[PDB]
CSV table of C-alpha atoms (C1' of nucleotides) and ligand atoms in Angstrom, one decimal:
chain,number,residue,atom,x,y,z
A,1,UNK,CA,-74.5,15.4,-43.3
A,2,UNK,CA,-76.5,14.0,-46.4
A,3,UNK,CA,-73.1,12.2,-47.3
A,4,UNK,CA,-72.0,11.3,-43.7
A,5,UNK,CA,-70.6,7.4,-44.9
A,6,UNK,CA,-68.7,8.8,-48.3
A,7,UNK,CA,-67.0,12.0,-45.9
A,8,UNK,CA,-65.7,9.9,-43.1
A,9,UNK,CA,-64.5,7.2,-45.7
A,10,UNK,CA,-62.2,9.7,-47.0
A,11,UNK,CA,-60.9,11.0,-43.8
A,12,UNK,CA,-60.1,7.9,-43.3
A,13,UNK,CA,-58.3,7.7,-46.3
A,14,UNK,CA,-56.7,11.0,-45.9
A,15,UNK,CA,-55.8,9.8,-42.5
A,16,UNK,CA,-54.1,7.1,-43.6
A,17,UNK,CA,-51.9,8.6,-46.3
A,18,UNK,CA,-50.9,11.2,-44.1
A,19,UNK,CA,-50.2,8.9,-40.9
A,20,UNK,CA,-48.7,5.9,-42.4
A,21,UNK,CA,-47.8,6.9,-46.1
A,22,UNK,CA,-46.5,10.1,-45.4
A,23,UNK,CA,-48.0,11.5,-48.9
A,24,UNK,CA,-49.3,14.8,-47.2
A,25,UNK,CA,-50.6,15.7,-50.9
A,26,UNK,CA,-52.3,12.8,-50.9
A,27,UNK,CA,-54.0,13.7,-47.8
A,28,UNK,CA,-54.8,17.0,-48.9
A,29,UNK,CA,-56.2,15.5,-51.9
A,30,UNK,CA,-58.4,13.3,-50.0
A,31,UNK,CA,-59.7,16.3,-47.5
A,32,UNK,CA,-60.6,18.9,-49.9
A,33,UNK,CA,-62.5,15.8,-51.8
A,34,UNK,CA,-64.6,15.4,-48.5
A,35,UNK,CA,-64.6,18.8,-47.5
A,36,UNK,CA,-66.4,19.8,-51.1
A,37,UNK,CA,-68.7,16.6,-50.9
A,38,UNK,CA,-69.5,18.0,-47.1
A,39,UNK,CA,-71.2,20.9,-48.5
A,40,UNK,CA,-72.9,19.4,-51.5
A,41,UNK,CA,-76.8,19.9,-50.7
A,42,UNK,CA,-78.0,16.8,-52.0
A,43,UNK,CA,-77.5,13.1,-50.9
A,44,UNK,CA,-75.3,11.6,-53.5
A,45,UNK,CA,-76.4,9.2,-55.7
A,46,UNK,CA,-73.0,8.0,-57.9
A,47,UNK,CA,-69.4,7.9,-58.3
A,48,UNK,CA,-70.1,9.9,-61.7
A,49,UNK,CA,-72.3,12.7,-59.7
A,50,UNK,CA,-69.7,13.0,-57.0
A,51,UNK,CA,-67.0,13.6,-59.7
A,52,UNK,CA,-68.8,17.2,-61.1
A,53,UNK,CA,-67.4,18.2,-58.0
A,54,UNK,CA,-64.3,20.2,-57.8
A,55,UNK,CA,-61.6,18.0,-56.0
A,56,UNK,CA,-63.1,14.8,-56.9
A,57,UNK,CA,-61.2,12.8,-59.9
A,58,UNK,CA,-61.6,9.5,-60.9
A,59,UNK,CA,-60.0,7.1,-58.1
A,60,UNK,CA,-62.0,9.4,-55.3
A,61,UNK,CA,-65.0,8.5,-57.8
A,62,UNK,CA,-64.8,4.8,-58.1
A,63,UNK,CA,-64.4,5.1,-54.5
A,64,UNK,CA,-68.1,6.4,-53.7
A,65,UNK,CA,-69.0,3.6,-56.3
A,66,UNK,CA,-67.9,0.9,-54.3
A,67,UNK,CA,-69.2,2.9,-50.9
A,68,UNK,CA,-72.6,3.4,-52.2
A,69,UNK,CA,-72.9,-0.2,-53.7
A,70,UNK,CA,-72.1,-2.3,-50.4
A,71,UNK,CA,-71.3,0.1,-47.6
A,72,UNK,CA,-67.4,-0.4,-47.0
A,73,UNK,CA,-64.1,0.1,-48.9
A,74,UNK,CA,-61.9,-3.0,-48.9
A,75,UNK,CA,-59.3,-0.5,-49.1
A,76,UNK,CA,-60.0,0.7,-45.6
A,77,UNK,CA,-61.4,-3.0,-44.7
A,78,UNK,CA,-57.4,-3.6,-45.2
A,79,UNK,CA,-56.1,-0.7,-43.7
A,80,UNK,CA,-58.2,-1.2,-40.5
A,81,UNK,CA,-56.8,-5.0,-40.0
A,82,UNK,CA,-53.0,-4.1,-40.7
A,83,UNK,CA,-51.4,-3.7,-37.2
A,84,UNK,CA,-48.6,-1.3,-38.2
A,85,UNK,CA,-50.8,0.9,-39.9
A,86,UNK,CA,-53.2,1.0,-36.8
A,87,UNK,CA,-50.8,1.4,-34.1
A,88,UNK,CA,-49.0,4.0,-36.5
A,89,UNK,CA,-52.4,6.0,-36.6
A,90,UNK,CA,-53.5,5.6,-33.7
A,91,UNK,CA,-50.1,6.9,-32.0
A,92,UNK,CA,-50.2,9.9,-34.1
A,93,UNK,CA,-53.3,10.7,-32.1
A,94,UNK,CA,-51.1,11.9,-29.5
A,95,UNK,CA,-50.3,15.5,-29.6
A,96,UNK,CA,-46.5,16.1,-30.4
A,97,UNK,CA,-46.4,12.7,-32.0
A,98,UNK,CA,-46.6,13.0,-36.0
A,99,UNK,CA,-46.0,10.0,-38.8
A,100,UNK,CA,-42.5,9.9,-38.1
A,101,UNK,CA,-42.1,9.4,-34.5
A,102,UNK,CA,-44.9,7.3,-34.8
A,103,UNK,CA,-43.0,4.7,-37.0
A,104,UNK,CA,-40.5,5.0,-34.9
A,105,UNK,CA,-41.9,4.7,-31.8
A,106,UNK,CA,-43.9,1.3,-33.4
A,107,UNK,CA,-40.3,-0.2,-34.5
A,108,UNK,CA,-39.3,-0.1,-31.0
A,109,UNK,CA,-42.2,-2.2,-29.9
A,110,UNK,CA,-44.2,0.7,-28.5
A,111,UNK,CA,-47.5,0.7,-29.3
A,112,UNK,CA,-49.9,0.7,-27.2
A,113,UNK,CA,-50.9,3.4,-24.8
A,114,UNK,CA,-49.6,1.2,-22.2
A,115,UNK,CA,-46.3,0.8,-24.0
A,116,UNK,CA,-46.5,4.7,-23.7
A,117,UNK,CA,-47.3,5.3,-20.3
A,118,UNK,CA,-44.4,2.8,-19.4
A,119,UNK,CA,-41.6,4.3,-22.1
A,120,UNK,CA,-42.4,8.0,-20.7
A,121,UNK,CA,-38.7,8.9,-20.7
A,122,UNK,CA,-38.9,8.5,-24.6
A,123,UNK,CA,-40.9,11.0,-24.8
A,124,UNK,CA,-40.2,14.7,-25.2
A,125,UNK,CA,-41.8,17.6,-23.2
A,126,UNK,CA,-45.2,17.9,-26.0
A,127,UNK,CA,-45.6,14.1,-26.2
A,128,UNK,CA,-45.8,13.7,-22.8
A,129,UNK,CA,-48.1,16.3,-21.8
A,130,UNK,CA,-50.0,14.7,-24.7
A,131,UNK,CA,-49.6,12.0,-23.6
A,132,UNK,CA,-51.0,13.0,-20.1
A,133,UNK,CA,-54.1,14.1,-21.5
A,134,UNK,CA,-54.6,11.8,-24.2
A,135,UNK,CA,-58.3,11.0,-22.9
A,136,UNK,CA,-59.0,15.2,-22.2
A,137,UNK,CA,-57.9,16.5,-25.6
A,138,UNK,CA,-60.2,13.9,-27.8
A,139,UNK,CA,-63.7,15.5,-26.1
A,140,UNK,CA,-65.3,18.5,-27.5
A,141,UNK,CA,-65.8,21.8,-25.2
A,142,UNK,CA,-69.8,22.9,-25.8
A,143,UNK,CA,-69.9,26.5,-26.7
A,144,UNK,CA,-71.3,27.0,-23.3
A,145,UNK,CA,-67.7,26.5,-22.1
A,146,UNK,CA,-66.3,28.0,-24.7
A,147,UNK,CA,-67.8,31.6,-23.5
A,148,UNK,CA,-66.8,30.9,-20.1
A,149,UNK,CA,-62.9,30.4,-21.2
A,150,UNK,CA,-63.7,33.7,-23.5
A,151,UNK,CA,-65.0,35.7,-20.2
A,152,UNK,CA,-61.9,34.6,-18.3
A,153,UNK,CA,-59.5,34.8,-20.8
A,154,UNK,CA,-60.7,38.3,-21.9
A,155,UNK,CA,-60.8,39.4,-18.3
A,156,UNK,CA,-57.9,38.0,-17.3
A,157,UNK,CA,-55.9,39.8,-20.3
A,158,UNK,CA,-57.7,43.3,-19.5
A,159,UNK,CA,-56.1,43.1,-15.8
A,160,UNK,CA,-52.6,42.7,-17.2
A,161,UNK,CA,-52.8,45.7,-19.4
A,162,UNK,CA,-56.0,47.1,-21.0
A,163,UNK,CA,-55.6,48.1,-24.4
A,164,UNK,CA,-54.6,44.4,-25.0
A,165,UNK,CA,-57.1,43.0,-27.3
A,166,UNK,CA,-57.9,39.1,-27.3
A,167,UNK,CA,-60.1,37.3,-29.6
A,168,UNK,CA,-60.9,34.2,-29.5
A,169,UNK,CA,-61.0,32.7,-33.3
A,170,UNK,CA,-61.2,29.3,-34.8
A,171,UNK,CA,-64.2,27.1,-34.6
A,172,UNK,CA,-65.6,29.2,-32.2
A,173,UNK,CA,-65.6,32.4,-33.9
A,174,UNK,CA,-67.2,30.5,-37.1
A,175,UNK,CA,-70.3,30.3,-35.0
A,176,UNK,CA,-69.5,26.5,-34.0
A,177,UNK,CA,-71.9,25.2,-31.5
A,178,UNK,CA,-69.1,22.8,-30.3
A,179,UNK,CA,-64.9,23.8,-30.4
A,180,UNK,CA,-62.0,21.1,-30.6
A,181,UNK,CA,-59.6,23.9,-28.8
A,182,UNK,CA,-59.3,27.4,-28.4
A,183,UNK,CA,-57.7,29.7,-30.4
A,184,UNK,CA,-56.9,33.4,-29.4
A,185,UNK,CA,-55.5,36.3,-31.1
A,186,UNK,CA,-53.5,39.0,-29.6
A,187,UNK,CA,-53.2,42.4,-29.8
A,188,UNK,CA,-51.3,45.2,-28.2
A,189,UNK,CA,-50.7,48.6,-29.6
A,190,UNK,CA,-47.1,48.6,-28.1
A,191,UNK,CA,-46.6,45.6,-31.3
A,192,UNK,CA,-46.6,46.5,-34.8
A,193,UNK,CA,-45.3,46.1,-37.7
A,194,UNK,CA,-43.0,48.6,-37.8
A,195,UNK,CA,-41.8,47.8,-34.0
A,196,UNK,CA,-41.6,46.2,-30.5
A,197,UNK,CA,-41.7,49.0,-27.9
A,198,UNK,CA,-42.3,46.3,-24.9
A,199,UNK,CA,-41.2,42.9,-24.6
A,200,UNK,CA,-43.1,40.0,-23.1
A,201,UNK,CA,-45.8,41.2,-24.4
A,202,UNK,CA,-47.0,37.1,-24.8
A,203,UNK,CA,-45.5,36.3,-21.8
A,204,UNK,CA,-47.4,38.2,-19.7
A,205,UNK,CA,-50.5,37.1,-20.4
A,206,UNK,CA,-49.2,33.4,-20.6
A,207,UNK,CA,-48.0,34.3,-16.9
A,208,UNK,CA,-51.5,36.2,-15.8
A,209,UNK,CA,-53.2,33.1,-17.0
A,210,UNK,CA,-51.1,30.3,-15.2
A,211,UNK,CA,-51.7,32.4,-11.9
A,212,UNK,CA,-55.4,32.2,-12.2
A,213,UNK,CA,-54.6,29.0,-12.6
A,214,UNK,CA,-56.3,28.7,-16.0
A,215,UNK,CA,-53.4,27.9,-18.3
A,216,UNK,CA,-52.1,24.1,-16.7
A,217,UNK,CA,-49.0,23.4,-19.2
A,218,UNK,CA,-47.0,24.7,-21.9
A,219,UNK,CA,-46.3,22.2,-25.1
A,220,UNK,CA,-44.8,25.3,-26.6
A,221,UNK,CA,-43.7,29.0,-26.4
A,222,UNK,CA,-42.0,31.5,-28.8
A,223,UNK,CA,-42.0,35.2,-28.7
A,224,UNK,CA,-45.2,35.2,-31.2
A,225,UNK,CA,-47.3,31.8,-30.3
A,226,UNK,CA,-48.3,29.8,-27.4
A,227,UNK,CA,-49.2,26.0,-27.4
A,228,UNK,CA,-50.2,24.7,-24.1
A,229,UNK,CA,-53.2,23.6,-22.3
A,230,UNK,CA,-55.8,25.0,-20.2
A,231,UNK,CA,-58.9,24.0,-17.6
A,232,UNK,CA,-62.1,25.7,-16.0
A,233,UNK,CA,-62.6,26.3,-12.6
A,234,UNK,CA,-65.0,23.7,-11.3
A,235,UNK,CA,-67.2,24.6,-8.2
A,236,UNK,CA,-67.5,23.0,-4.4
A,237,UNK,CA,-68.1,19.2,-5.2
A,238,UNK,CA,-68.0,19.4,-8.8
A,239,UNK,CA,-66.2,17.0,-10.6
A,240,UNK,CA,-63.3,18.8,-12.8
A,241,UNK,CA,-63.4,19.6,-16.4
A,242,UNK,CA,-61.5,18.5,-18.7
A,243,UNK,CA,-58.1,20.4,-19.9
A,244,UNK,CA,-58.4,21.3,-23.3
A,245,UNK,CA,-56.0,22.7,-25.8
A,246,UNK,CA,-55.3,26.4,-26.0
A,247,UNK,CA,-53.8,28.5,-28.8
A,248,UNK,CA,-52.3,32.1,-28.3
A,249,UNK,CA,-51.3,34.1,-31.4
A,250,UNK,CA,-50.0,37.8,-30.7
A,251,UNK,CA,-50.2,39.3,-34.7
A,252,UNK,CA,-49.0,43.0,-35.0
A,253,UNK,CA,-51.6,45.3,-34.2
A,254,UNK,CA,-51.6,47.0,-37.6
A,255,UNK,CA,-51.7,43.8,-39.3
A,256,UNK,CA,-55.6,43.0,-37.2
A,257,UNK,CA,-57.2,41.8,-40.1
A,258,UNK,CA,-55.3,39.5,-41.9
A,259,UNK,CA,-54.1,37.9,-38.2
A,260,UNK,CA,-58.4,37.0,-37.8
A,261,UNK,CA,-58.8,36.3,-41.4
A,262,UNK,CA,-55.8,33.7,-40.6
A,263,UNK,CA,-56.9,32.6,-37.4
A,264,UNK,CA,-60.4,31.7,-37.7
A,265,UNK,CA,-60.0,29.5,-41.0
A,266,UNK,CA,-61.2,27.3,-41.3
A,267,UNK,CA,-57.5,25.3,-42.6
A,268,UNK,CA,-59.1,24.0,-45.0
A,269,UNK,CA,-60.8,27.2,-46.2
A,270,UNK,CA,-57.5,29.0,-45.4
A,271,UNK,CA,-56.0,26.7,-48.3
A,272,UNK,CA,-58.9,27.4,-50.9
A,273,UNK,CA,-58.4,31.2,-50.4
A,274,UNK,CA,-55.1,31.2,-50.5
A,275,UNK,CA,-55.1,29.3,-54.0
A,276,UNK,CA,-57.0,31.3,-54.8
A,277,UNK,CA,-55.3,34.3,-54.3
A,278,UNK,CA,-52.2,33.0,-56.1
A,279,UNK,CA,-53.9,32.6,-59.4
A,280,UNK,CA,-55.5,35.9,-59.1
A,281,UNK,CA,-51.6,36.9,-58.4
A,282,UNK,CA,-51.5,37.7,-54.9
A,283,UNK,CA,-49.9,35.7,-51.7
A,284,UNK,CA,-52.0,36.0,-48.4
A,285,UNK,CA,-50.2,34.8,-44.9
A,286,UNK,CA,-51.3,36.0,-41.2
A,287,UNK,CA,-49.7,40.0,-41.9
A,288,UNK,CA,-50.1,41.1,-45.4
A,289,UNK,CA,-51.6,40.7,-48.9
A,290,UNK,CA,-49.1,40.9,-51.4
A,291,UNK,CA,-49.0,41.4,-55.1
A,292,UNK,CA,-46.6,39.1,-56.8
A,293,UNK,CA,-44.5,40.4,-59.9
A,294,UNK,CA,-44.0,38.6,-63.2
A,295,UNK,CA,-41.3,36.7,-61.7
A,296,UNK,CA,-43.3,35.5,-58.5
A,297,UNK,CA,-41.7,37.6,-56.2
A,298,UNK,CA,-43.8,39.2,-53.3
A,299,UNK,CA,-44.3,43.0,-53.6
A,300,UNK,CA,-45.2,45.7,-50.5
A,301,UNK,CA,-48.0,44.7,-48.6
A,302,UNK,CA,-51.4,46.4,-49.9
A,303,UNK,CA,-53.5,48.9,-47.9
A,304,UNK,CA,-56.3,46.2,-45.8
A,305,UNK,CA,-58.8,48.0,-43.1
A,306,UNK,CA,-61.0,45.2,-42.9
A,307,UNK,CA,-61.8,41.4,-43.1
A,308,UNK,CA,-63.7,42.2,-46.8
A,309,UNK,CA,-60.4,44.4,-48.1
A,310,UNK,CA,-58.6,41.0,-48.5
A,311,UNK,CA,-61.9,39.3,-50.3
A,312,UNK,CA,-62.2,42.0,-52.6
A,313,UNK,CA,-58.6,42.2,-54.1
A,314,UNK,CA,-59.1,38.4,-54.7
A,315,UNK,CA,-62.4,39.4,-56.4
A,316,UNK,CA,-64.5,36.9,-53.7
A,317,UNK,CA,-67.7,38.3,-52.3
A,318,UNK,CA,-67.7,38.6,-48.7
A,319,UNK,CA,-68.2,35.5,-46.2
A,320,UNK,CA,-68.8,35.6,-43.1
A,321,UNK,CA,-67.1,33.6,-40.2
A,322,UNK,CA,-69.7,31.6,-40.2
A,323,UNK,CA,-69.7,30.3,-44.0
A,324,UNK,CA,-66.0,29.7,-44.0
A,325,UNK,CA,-66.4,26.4,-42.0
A,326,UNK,CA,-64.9,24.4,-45.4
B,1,DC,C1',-48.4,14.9,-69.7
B,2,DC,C1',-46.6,17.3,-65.3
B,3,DG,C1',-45.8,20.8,-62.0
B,4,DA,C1',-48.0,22.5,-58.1
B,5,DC,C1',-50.5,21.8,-54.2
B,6,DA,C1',-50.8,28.0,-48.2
B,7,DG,C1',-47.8,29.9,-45.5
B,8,DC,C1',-45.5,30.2,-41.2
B,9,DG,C1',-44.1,29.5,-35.6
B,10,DC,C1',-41.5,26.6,-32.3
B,11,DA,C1',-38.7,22.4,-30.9
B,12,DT,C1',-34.9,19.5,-32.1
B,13,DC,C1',-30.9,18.1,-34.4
B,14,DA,C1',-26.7,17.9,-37.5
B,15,DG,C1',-22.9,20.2,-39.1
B,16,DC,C1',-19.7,23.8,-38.4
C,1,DG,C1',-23.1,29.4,-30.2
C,2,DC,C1',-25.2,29.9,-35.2
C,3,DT,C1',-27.6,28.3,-39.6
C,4,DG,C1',-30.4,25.4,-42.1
C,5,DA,C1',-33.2,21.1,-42.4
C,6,DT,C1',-36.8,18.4,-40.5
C,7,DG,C1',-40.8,17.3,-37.5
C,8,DC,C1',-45.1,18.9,-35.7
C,9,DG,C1',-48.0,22.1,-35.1
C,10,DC,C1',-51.4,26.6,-36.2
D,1,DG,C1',-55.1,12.3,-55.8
D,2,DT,C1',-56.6,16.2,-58.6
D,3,DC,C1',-56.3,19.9,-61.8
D,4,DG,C1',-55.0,23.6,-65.1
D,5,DG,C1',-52.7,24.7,-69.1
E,401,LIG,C1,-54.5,23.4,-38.5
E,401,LIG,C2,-54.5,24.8,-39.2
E,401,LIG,C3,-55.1,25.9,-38.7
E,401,LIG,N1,-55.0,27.1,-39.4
E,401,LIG,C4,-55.7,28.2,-38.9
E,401,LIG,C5,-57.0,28.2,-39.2
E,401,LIG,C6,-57.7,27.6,-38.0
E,401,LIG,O1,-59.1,27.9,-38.0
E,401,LIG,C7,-56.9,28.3,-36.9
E,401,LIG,C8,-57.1,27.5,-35.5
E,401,LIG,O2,-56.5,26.2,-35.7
E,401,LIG,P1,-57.3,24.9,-35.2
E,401,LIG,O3,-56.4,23.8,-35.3
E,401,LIG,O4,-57.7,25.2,-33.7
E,401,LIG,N2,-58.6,24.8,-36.2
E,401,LIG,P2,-60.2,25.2,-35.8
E,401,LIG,O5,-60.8,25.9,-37.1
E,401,LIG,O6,-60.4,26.1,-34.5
E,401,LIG,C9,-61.2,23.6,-35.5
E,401,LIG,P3,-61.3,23.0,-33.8
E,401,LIG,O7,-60.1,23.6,-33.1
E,401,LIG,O8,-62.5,23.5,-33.2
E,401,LIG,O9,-61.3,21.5,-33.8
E,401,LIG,O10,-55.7,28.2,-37.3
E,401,LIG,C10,-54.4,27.1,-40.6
E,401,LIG,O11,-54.4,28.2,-41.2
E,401,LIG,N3,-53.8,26.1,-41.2
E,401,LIG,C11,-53.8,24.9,-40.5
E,401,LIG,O12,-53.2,23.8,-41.1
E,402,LIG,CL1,-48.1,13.1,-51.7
E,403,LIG,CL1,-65.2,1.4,-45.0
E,404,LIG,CL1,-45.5,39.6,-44.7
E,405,LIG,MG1,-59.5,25.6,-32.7
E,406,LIG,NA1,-64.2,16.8,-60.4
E,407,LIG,NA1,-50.2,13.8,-33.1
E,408,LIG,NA1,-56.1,25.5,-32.1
DNA sequence: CCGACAGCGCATCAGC
DNA sequence: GCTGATGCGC
DNA sequence: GTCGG
């Protein structure tokens, strides 16, 4: 974090355009910028050195200019002091609530999380169990509790059937020593690509984990993905943990490695590959890597036993989990 | 200059 | 009910 | 906002 001040500035900017602008390029624009500057090994000197960087242009550059010369943006200075724009953000900080319910929600007077709290009937089922744990899902989960979630939730998916498989991806599989959420992907040999020979495959493990009493609330459920929320155990005269955020994705069991390639990202670097992949001339989602034809239609999936398979028809040497934190 | 910017699951709604 | 668009999420 | 062509 050589370039802590210039990163954050951006997020904020990024955070901004997406929140209150609505310019999601914009945003993207702005987090790529950061996230390149984030892995630049020296401390940054000038607008000018910033801008050899891939992803920084020349607004992004005057930018660290202005940073580096007196520690602040007026830009932001602005931002920060304009009360739509700050009780826009700041709702959007609630999961279920995006830019657009946000505006809303601030051009009916509500604003505050009090104004929340008290308008909880204009909520929908996600906003208010966001809502509910507004204070929960901003804290971290050390990697400590991350491998105790991992030994239940592995445990707890073995009893239901055992040739499920569950990995637990995201942060957390990139080696993180701290996780926002967790993220787990499913397996079961009964779901491939070529068929579902058992239903409630997802289900059932949702179900097994609610009994244990380790899954707490649903935001949502689909045949596919699960968004909901979880919580340790805590012992005799312990005070509780927090509930965190869980993410369930069942991926067809054939399709293994591009589900994990998908799944532990990070976003960010899930973008750059996938760019990247187009102007070699292939498309990469959660199942398959694809050729595309002249006219920029998909073809059949290509033959991929292995994480590597999909770097190597890219022509990208190999990273590891832990090098894709972009 | 300017078109493109990753790719997709689930919830909600409008229009039929 | 369905289909397609939009919002919010991964 | 940035970039490739
Ligand atoms: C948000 C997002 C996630 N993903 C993938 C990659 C990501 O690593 C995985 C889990 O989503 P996440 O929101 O939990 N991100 P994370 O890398 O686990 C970071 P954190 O959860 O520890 O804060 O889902 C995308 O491909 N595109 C996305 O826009
Ligand atoms: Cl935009
Ligand atoms: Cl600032
Ligand atoms: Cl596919
Ligand atoms: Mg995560
Ligand atoms: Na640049
Ligand atoms: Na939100
Ligand atoms: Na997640």
């Amino acid at each position: 974090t050589l370039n802590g001040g210039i990163t954050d500035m951006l997020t904020e900017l990024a955070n901004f355009e997406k929140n209150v602008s609505q310019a999601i390029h914009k945003y993207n624009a702005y987090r790529k910028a950061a996230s390149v500057i984030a892995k630049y090994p020296h401390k940054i000197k000038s607008g000018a050195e910033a801008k050899k960087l891939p992803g920084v242009g020349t607004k992004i550059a005057e930018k660290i200019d202005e940073f580096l010369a007196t520690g602040k943006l007026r830009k932001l200075e602005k931002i920060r002091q304009d009360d739509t724009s700050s009780s826009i953000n700041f709702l959007t900080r609630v999961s279920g609530i995006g830019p657009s319910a946000a505006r809303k929600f601030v051009d009916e007077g509500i604003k505050t999380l009090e104004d929340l709290r008290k308008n909880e009937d204009k909520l929908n089922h996600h906003q208010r169990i966001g809502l509910k744990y507004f204070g929960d899902f901003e804290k971290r989960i050390p990697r400590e509790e991350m491998l105790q979630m991992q030994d239940i939730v592995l445990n707890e998916v073995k009893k239901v059937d055992s040739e499920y498989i569950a990995t637990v991806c995201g942060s957390f599989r990139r080696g993180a020593e701290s996780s926002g959420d967790m993220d787990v992907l499913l397996t079961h040999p009964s779901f491939t690509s070529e068929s579902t020979k058992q239903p409630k495959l997802l289900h059932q493990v949702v179900e097994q984990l609610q009994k244990v009493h380790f899954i707490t609330d649903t935001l949502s459920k689909g045949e596919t993905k699960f968004m909901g929320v979880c919580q340790l155990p805590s012992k005799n005269d312990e005070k509780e943990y927090p509930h965190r955020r869980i993410d369930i994705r069942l991926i067809p069991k054939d399709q293994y490695y591009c589900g994990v390639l998908y799944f532990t990202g990070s976003d960010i670097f899930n973008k750059n590959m996938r760019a990247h992949a187009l102007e070699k001339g292939f498309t990469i989602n959660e199942y398959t890597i694809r050729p595309l034809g002249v006219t920029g239609v998909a073809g059949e999936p290509l033959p991929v036993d292995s994480e590597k398979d999909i770097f190597d028809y890219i022509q990208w040497k190999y990273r590891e989990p832990k090098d894709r934190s972009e």
